[PDB]
Amino acid sequence: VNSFSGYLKLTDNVYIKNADIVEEAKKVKPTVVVNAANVYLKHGGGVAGALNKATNNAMQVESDDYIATNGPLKVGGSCVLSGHNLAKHCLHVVGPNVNKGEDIQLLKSAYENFNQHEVLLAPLLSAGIFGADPIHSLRVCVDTVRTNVYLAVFDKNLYDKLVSSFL
């Protein structure tokens, strides 16, 4: 039993809700919140910009030190950093950004990072400003993640489409 509330159950291990991931994380304080990161951990917009804003820019400060030490992430890769005031940990995961010409096949590799964590709050990878079809992202999630994932979809219209189109 966990404290996530109001989710629709899609499969044994995948759950979905129309919610603002920032407000969800503040309420639940999950062990792991997933960020829709880029390889530079520049959290300028989309989910990343919203999560970073909610940390009063502390996420960005920590991220800049991480990059200065380690260099950029790989597309499809991840790193674990602090969750600040939102969660114990933040798993920064880089899905492909179609608006950069990145291989959509890397989306499965990106979701594989979730399997290193028993329970996660997450957005759909490569959705929104990363330019992929959120319906496809949900399919890859369900077919790749085996741990317990609570998906937050900001747009109510899109949420209804993902559910009503979910196979």
Ligand SMILES: CC(C)(CO)Nc1ncnc2[nH]ccc12
């Ligand atoms: C990634 C996508 C398209 C669906 O998960 N968007 C979001 N989902 C949840 N919280 C969010 N906050 C800001 C944007 C956003």
Ligand SMILES: [Cl-]
């Ligand atoms: Cl977005």
